[PDB]
Amino acid sequence: SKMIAVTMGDPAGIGPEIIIKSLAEGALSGAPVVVVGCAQTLRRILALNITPRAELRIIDHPAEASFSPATINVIDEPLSDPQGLRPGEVQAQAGDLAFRCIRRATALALEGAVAAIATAPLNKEALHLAGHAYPGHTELLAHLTQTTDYAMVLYTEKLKVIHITTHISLRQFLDTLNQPRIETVIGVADRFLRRVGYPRPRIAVAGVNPHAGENGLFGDEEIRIVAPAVAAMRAKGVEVTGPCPPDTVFMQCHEGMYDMVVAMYHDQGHIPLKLLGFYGVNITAGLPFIRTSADHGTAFDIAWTGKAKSESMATSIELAMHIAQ
Amino acid sequence: SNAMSKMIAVTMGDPAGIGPEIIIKSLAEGALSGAPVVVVGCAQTLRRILALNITPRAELRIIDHPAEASFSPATINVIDEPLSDPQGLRPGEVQAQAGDLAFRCIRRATALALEGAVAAIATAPLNKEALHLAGHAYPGHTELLAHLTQTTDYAMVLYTEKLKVIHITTHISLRQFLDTLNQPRIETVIGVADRFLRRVGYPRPRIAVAGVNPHAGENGLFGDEEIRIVAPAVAAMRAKGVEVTGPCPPDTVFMQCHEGMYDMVVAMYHDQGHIPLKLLGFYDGVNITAGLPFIRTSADHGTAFDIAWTGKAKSESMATSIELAMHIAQE
Numbered sequence A: 001s002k003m004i005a006v007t008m009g010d011p012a013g014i015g016p017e018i019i020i021k022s023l024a025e026g027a028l029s030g031a032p033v034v035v036v037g038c039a040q041t042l043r044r045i046l047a048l049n050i051t052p053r054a055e056l057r058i059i060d061h062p063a064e065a066s067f068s069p070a071t072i073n074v075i076d077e078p079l080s081d082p083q084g085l086r087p088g089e090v091q092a093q094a095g096d097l098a099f100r101c102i103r104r105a106t107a108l109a110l111e112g113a114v115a116a117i118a119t120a121p122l123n124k125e126a127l128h129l130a131g132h133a134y135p136g137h138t139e140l141l142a143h144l145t146q147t148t149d150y151a152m153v154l155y156t157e158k159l160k161v162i163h164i165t166t167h168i169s170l171r172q173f174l175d176t177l178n179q180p181r182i183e184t185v186i187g188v189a190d191r192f193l194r195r196v197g198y199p200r201p202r203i204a205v206a207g208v209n210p211h212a213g214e215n216g217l218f219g220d221e222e223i224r225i226v227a228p229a230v231a232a233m234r235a236k237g238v239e240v241t242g243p244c245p246p247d248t249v250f251m252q253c254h255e256g257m258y259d260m261v262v263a264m265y266h267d268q269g270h271i272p273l274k275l276l277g278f279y280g281v282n283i284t285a286g287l288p289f290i291r292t293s294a295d296h297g298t299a300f301d302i303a304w305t306g307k308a309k310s311e312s313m314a315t316s317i318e319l320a321m322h323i324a325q
Numbered sequence B: 001s002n003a004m005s006k007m008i009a010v011t012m013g014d015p016a017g018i019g020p021e022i023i024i025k026s027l028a029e030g031a032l033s034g035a036p037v038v039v040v041g042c043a044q045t046l047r048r049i050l051a052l053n054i055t056p057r058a059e060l061r062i063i064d065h066p067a068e069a070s071f072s073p074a075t076i077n078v079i080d081e082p083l084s085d086p087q088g089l090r091p092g093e094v095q096a097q098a099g100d101l102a103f104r105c106i107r108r109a110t111a112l113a114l115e116g117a118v119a120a121i122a123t124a125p126l127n128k129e130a131l132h133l134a135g136h137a138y139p140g141h142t143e144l145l146a147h148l149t150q151t152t153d154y155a156m157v158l159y160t161e162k163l164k165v166i167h168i169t170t171h172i173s174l175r176q177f178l179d180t181l182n183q184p185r186i187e188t189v190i191g192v193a194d195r196f197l198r199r200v201g202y203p204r205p206r207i208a209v210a211g212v213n214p215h216a217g218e219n220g221l222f223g224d225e226e227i228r229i230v231a232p233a234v235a236a237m238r239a240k241g242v243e244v245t246g247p248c249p250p251d252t253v254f255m256q257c258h259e260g261m262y263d264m265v266v267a268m269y270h271d272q273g274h275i276p277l278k279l280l281g282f283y284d285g286v287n288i289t290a291g292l293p294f295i296r297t298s299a300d301h302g303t304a305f306d307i308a309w310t311g312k313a314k315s316e317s318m319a320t321s322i323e324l325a326m327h328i329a330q331e
């Protein structure tokens, strides 16, 4: 039984309650999931009657987990002051816990004690206040695993995408586009797909401009940057093609012509995925293990009220499990 | 005529291209057999195509005016706009007489649409080089139609029952889109969208405007086009009573429209609007040139001189464009 670790995230946010909701009932009840988090915090949430009931089984190591419906196995990573934590506020002890849970889960994944991680949201202000000077999970995970090259993947059965960049302006994407990064991401895609079991991954690389530039009629990015990256990776034995017209390449992948598309920018890849009804499926590819997450924040405005939806947390756990098993 | 609806015109386009054969295939059989469609084109060219046995059979009914049409299955009503030398025309070659015909059919059909004799035009493709060689200095249909109807403000619409999109920009580089994005154009396109949908019969169209940057900028974290250009356009049009909202995150706005939250999305650039439509299966690129005084449609195919007059060109997109023109024309 391949296990998933789930990190608590910021305990003052919605992470604790969406973890309990995800694991206490429904499809993931009794699933092989180990929570790395503050057990006392989980108990405070349970006492507020804002989630289904659950028994906690505290453990020291994933190999000591015992899975059953309505029980949550927890490796306790304690807050310094669990009873003093205030809901929905930026607190150093909360940012510190978010960091420590990621650190501990990462160590377990690197040892092979768990197969993958699914992360609950952290608050970057609190993370920084606690002395952890990372923009977010991605840079922290990269540091803890000595991973230089990584990229965001959206993963569904029929359409998979990996992104050259994500949360930057469209203009910045154009002004930073570069051949080394595209080659790197093609390589990350190939290794990622091999590791999920595709012996000979078929990868398509999207162009930048309409019609992939129509032979230079629109822009020069395809001839000067994208096509040379494709050629270099084809020479290195990757089954990669492109540049491909953006408005047909995702369609082609969805129809089974390719296993994954390399999208040039956030919306190029996100628009098609979310239209197909995937509004929990993001993977940080390139790390030594699979890491999933949801696109939502800590939601301090509603934290500890039971209003936050747990579906994206559950979807991220399900995805990690699916790939691991 | 014996139409039970408004009629539309179909223009032949460049006769040396695939226009003639895809018109015949569209109208001679299948869904549009007997439909209230009048072809404006060179009848002798259609007869040359029929004699090549590269299409289904069809009887031609030549007429002088749409009101004199008589619609029936496997018959095509044609207002004959003749080539200067129909028997000398060569398939799949740039020829002045072909460009001249393409122009004349558009001119004649436009006059009929403006007079109300037909309610829309669906165009077959023309060849720009031939159009220019015939002394008609236009990049293509859109500019020619805009000129003949004195239309300044227009935009490309993709139309399905669940997802409709109108474009700020289309065939330009992403960099040129970013360098030329301006508030007046966005206001104009919102206006074109509102008028188009009200005409269709949506008294209070719900229009969403897509952002430029991821998360529509995320309150400025990922760029400022939304704050400086797009949001002011939306506010200006809301002040004119348009039910317009945005800027919206690009990766959720098309999905929301598709789910029924909005009637139409204003897309900022070509791929932003084209990726979602082609993913849902609409790969033919049928589109409406919105803002003209009448409905005009077309498919995204060219003249395909490589296969012209061989019967290999697919007619499905032509048929879909005729069907869409006919449908939208009924409002």
Ligand SMILES: [Cl-]
Binding pocket: B119, B199, B294, B295, B328, B329, B330, B331
């Ligand atoms: Cl109308």
Ligand code: NI
Binding pocket: A167, A266, A295, B214, B215
């Ligand atoms: Ni995002």
Ligand code: NI
Binding pocket: A210, A211, B171, B270
């Ligand atoms: Ni196009």
